[PDB]
Amino acid sequence: HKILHRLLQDS
Amino acid sequence: HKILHRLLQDS
Amino acid sequence: DMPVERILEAELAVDPVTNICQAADKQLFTLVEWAKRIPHFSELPLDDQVILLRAGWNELLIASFSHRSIAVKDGILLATGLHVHRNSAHSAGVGAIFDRVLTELVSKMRDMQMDKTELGCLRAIVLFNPDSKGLSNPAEVEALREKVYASLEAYCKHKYPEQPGRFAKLLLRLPALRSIGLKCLEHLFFFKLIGDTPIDTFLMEMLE
Amino acid sequence: DMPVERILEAELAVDPVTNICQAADKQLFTLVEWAKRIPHFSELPLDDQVILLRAGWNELLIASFSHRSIAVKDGILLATGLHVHRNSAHSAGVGAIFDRVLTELVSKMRDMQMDKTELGCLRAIVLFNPDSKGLSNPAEVEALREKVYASLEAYCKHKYPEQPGRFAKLLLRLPALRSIGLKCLEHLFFFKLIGDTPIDTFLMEMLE
């Protein structure tokens, strides 16, 4: 789930 | 709702 | 005012899709007698009693068969004494909701050893549902709900003082029960649509 | 351990169907930042964070727009600043669920003056949903849920000691929120099916 998985790692 | 309304009054 | 002993007394007093429908119909008659034994329910306006039972019967029955099934291995004990296990559930097309019943209700009731007083109180909370459409005075129903959970909390804190979170843990099975009830009802409407329900029953009235 | 001040900080830190979809999409990005600010959420395995947010986003957003709409007369304030009122809701085909939002959530939040700490704690309870399918260790999520509601209860009993039932009253909006979320999701899936959703969005991923 590429958007959510990226946003969770984005600081 | 004839069944339920009757059963509620049945003692 | 809303004594848990009276709610306990009420509990103690009372083809796979054919079996599921016959079991639900059997328990609808019993459920009316149960509701009359819950303090103050029979004092509500009759039309409001009708509204509450039409709004809540399905969740009330699901809570009861879930608790009854604690001692069953990977299955549901229907009120007729017949079991639903995984193969039957899939033949009926209800395998996914069967799995949710076991994981979200039966197993959680078992793990915490939910007792019959607690079960009865959760069922009375569901019965006294103030969001039920068309109630003559929804706040009177909320008032009765609040009496039930005040009594439930005092019961849990007296019997299980080493489990301070137990009261909230009981209440927080009710969103699962709501979801699960919506899906079971969907299945029952489908069984009615295609003609797999016994006809001329109290269940059919609830589905109409 | 699970301080309500941190949950409050997280709250404070963050065609009608086109408007509804654009508002939900906007708030999905914000919701991820909110969840990272809830104590211990970011310590869960990443795949479990994904599971919790996919399971809970819709209820989490509905709780937030409902509380935001307390000061609106007979309507919903979307995160974009646009209002949904009854005529727009019916044009979108969502008049019945709109009415349920107002009667079961907005008006009840307003009547009891649910505060932002309480809202944030209910949202963290919904976030930490241990029934979410596929979690690596559902009990770890239940453990975090139980820390939230222990903190919420202590907050309510300190701030509102003259309302002993307030904690349970908050928790007993969660079955309504669950029902309402299921119906809103149904509407959103339909908007996607017929091609009325903006494409290439985070909302579309949540709906896929």
Ligand SMILES: CC(C)c1cccc(-c2cc(/C=C/C(=O)O)ccc2O)c1
């Ligand atoms: C979980 C699965 C077996 C499934 C599917 C659809 C409907 C139902 C369903 C069954 C009953 C049975 C009650 C009893 O024997 O006490 C009552 C209400 C119900 O919704 C169950």
Ligand SMILES: CC(C)c1cccc(-c2cc(/C=C/C(=O)O)ccc2O)c1
């Ligand atoms: C109540 C009605 C307006 C309806 C219908 C279908 C979907 C939704 C829906 C809207 C949002 C909006 C969030 C915001 O503006 O903060 C988020 C999730 C949602 O499910 C609402």
